[PDB]
């Protein structure tokens, strides 16, 4: 995620763009995912349960 | 809808960088077919072609390098 | 693999009549034709037909009375795993004689009532209620 601030761009608009960019890139989620190991059985269990709840 | 089925492409070519750049984010990550609408067969062809193009340094692996 | 085509025929009858099928089709065979003939004579089915030369099909037209199956039950008794034969003095009576047993006697396939009248035993194929 990179932001170039345009001429006469307000700084807080640049902050808004930076926040939305890094959120859309998923960087923070990817960092939080990797701080602890997860057994493959646990990964598959969470995936399965998420899919199971994706029903109307 | 899927561009490759509308055209009737037989195989996606890693050398068609003008096409492949439409399916990567600005950070170089492969865009999910959920967003592009690409049919699964062509999504798999995209992924292989993009990885080959990365190895040839035609596309970046990462935003930063 | 298929190893008892007679139980196959009987099961096709049972299932088709439970599903209210108008008619059922199965691979033909001399013994199947004989059994269907006996069932038609006893009135458990409306009709039967055989069609084709190289791979003949057999069709049975099922029978219903007041909206319900005329065949109450149909049960294989002799089977490949355990063959059953009876003497003249031991032929069973199905539903005390309301149903029929089908007996392959030495004179051919016939009802147990016929076999008793003829004085024969045989292999007992099935019970029909």
């Amino acid at each position: 995620p990179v932001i170039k601030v345009r001429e006469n761009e307000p700084f807080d608009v640049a902050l808004r763009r930076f926040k939305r960019s890094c959120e859309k890139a998923g960087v923070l989620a990817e960092v939080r995912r990797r701080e602890f190991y997860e057994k493959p059985t646990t990964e598959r269990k969470r995936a399965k349960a998420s899919a199971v709840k994706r029903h109307a | 809808f899927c561009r490759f089925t509308a055209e009737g492409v037989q195989e996606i070519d890693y050398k068609d960088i003008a096409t492949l750049k439409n399916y990567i984010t600005e950070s170089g990550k492969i865009v999910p077919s959920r967003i592009t609408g690409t049919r699964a067969k062509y999504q798999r062809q995209l992924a292989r072609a993009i990885k080959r193009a990365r190895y040839l340094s035609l596309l970046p692996y990462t935003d930063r390098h | 693999s298929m190893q008892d085509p007679i139980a196959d025929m009987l099961t096709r009858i049972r299932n088709g009549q439970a599903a209210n099928k108008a008619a059922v089709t199965m691979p033909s065979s001399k013994l199947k034709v004989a059994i269907a003939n006996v069932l038609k004579e006893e009135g458990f089915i409306e009709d039967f037909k055989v069609e084709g030369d190289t791979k003949p099909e057999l069709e049975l037209t099922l029978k219903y009375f007041q909206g319900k199956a005329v065949v109450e039950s149909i049960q294989r008794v002799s089977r490949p795993g355990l063959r059953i034969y009876k003497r003249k003095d031991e032929l069973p009576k199905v539903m005390a004689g309301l149903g029929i047993a089908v007996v392959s006697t030495s004179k051919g396939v016939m009802t147990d009532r016929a076999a008793r009248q003829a004085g024969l035993g045989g292999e007992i194929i099935c019970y029909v209620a």
């Binding site: - | 070519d13 080959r52 990365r54 | -």
Partner: protein
Amino acid sequence: MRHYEIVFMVHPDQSEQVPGMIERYTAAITGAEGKIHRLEDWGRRQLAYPINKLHKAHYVLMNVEAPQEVIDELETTFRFNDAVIRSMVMRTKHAVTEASPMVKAK
């Protein structure tokens, strides 16, 4: 015999030698009763990320029909030839005479 697509890229300082390598390798295939269905020279082209600190490597692409041993000979000469910085051999479903998008972009 099998069809292969071969892309190799060369240190820019060696660009003027690219016609020589080609003539050798095009010989090595054809002298083995292989045949070359096409050759494209893309010249110096910018890299997406630095390799060996280099940039602007000189790309060459060719499509060839050859027996396995000739192609593993060619790849093992690419291995020790210090001019070639990166190489790729991909077996191909069919012969391909049509020019690449990289040329037709010109």
